[PDB]
Ligand binder design. Sequence first.
Ligand code: DJL
Ligand code: DJL
Lengths: 642, 645
Amino acid sequence: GSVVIVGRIILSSITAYSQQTRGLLGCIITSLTGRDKNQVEGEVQVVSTATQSFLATCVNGVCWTVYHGAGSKTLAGPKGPITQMYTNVDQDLVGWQAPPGARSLTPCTCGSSDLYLVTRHADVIPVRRRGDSRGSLLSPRPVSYLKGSSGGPLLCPSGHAVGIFRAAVCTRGVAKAVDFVPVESMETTMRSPVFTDNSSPPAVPQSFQVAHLHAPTGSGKSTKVPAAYAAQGYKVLVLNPSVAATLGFGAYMSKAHGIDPNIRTGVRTITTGAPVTYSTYGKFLADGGCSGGAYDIIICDECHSTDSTTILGIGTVLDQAETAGARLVVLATATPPGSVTVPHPNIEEVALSNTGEIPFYGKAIPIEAIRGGRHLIFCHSKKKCDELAAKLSGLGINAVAYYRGLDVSVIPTIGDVVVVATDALMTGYTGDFDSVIDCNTCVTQTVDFSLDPTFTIETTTVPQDAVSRSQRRGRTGRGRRGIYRFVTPGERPSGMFDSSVLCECYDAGCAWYELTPAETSVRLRAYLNTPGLPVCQDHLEFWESVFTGLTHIDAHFLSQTKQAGDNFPYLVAYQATVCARAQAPPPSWDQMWKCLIRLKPTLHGPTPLLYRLGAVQNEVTLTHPITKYIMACMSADLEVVT
Amino acid sequence: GSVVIVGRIILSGSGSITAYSQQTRGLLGCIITSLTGRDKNQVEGEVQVVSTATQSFLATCVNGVCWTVYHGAGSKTLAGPKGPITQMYTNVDQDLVGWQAPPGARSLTPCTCGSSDLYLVTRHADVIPVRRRGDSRGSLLSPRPVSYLKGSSGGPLLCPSGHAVGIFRAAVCTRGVAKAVDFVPVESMETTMRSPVFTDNSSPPAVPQSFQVAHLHAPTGSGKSTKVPAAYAAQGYKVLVLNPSVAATLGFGAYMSKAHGIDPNIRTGVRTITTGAPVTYSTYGKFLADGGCSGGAYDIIICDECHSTDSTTILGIGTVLDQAETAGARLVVLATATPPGSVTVPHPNIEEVALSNTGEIPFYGKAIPIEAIRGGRHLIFCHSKKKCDELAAKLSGLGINAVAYYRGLDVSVIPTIGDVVVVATDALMTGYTGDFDSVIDCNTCVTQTVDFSLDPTFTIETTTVPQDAVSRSQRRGRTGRGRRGIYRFVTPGERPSGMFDSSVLCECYDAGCAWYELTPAETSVRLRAYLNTPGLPVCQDHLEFWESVFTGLTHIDAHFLSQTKQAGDNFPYLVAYQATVCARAQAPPPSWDQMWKCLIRLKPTLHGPTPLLYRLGAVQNEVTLTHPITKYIMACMSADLEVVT
Ligand SMILES: CC[C@@H]([NH3+])c1ccc(Cl)c(Oc2ccccc2)c1F
Ligand SMILES: CC[C@@H]([NH3+])c1ccc(Cl)c(Oc2ccccc2)c1F
């Protein structure tokens, strides 16, 4: 899909009105063709994808807008799809060369503080500047009235551009201020090189530096380059999210480059005194971060991964490495933020159709496509893994399921097999496959600041992004031919993660890694402040304030929720602690609250709700001091995107 | 736009009930197929996954007919092999519509036996045990979040033999958790088929010998409010004609006096005459303020414009329905041009023309050419007061006799006189009786919708929405009366007619308490008479919920209530009640929006967090939730609440 211009906002002194130029059918066709003959006029376009509508402002002969709406998408144009000229994920800014007929606003350098925000409804909202990227609405408005206006201009009185709107600053679901991308960030972006080669590892610098390495999985980014550095005489640490990949490196390196390295995972540890160590991020955090002077170079592998341990591990390194004596951090991934999937030479891509004995996410699989050989099928849930595995087994296909919870020994490693699995596979098992068949959806978690009474953490099924598609497809075609089959050809933009991931980081810090919320904030802040990494909204003070209130948890419930191994074991266990001390029942008797089951006969009355982590069946009271505390925390300034 | 089959749910041949889905169309194919109404793909399976541009749900063929929900499909056609298929059955009251099953389509068959173990099929092909507890209700064996059931409406409930018991249309929820499911029984599908496919309501009924409720679906200028009661009067019957508009009511009476001979009784706030005639013209508000039906006074009651869903009208009609038989009436007539289920058909006096981007006057993303309005009598419907004032301004500056009209302004500001462009809200339709050479329609209106948002209680939010058939049909109606007329529009779209939000029920209790001295219990009886009567606009049964809420709100401040009644805005009771609770705690209102002006003079003495009862708009001030009324309302949210799927 391409981005499509579906209207415009005309400026004149400052007033505006808007014009629509496409309906739905036109938008969709134009988005599939990427061919737009419609004449472009104005400095503000109203634009749309198949999922959202927003604005775009031309400045300096460039049409600009937000990464969180456009991603890395092309813009439909007279002669076809227009590739983006600039892609600055870190500033939430992208830009296409202005098409013929378009006008540009000029930047503002008189430096006025009385500003005017233009919306998708063509209203003109006065704004008092507060900083480089903040302004306060003179009249607070409900957040919903700014929705769809991301990308609109912030104008000084003389009509020039100060920047583009990117998000509202809410206080309890009401917008008192606005975040914008300032015109100086636009000019900085324009002077940066479009091509920047991150395929070569850099040489060790004289003083501390953070460098990026974008290279295919099996370039030797985690094998050959660590070996090269060690030859030059350095001590190198390779961090990786998979236990099975970390272990695998030990045997590979001892054969191929004659180095028997240190290995550090939770299930196994080996110290050989070698100058190269391979660790998981999680085991790295358990060992208490950087040891003063132990390493010259730290290589954070798969730094595209947006799981809490990886983010927390990488932010720890970014906070500590210099102080502990390192000269070099290398952030390594094949799929960096802003990447899209491109054709792979070694992999042949074939859409699924409706003909097939095996129904699969609305489409079908031919039994002839998986009868012999080794094939991997990605499903979104374990329930689905289980039922597809059973089907296949009943047809006499040798088929097995894999997901979080199961021992990887369900393998088999040699022989005909179909593996039906979730993304747990990515970290659990390292082999590749004659084909990958991919449902193209993922389970993820999303926070909702629902003030009912506090927040909600919802589990939802959503389309895959560009990293998911590439990483799943990349389980076939490794040094040998391969096939990838898909239910749908789409792709969400890569490199963003939800605020629940942040909440997860504080939770794990408390549950697993003996980190105070203040400590956790320091480490995440280094992650945020370092560019070229995945991006999120800055909700650190909020989440810090919330967990900071969660005191004197019951150690047995914590142990039990960690043991059962599910999400947010600290939030779950803290709610259970409050329920037990208040002598009151849990929100439900879902498996989530089984730590309270022996107390079931004696718990009665309304649940002192702290927050929603699933369905709430029981009645709730709001009188508990901890609830009162978390409600007060919601008055904090919260960026939400528009 | 037609409904389009975009996929299907395939049920298992034997053993235990299981299913899987197949998708036969993408988005592009869906949109094209909806605009042409032509679907050459063949129809397999008995459970279809259907879609409009706006939403998607399920449809289930039983005994020859592809059934689904009115709240999903409205009166729309089904895309077919030889073009659009019109609906064969349209039952607004049961939330059930039906197209004749296309070629070779397969139909489930009814639950002949009579088990009480049931299985619901969802759009995800999940099969979910249900326990029948009534004709149209069964409980989920394992309660679920209601989000999981959205888009499954129209799906079947099966008995273990795989026979259809009905089709899902809504969940019963407790605080966001579906505990049970509502369906349209299969025998309500056969009650639908053992009626005639066409019913006639174009002629006023004969007076029956015993109490009967009849419907009159006939256009304005058929004389529904002048000629027909005149006719009944001529046969010696006493007749009451009720209407939502003061100006319409006065006009009919004045027309009757000079044309049909009679000098009728008139009853409104502003003018009331007793002449002893056997025809009486009243508004719904005055009828209610008079305490409803007085014994033996009328044989016939015409409830005119019975399509209207303002609180007064609903409350008024509810009253007549509850009180007429016992007051000795023989006949209640529910009269409208635009009954529930109706569609905007072409009018031979009216030339319909799409606005373009060509024009000097920007209008809702399109354009009005000055030529089209420079000379004559013209009407422009805008959704908000604000826009009307912007558009009157922008028009007159360019040399026009432009004027606005919306609630608050006195009519007569609309002259006549000749050349004019009136820019107005829908308030035009209760304030002014005249018509125009052309009508220009923004195709949108403001409405109010309730969210059970548990933050802490409920929210009532003003939103802007696409117009429905009634809206479009009534807005067009102000041109092409006798002579030729023109209708210009921004959008061809049209939402289904005859549904109203739960917030409208809220307004009925509020008006009950604020204007007409009705206890919540007394209002429930009246509303119950309206729901139970068929062929009237329909809503979700939340009567107990809303009764329970207003029953708690006692000892309101008489002064604030008088000011919110006078200012004329919605929910004067809830607004005044929140203010009563604020003033008594010396706390500020949730904001300093105009809604809270009754409290402006006390601003100096009002400090601290607002004890919030519910949300009627943005809340800027901190909130406490400790107030006994807040808690009382919080407990009411435990009620069983039907919500759609
Ligand atoms: C410029 C501020 C930075 N924190 C930032 C950078 C890029 C993007 Cl897409 C940002 O917004 C989101 C919004 C939702 C999810 C992730 C990120 C974002 F908030
Ligand atoms: C059969 C139950 C009846 N109360 C009923 C009849 C028709 C329809 Cl469209 C119903 O559903 C709605 C849903 C939303 C708004 C109004 C009505 C509905 F609830």
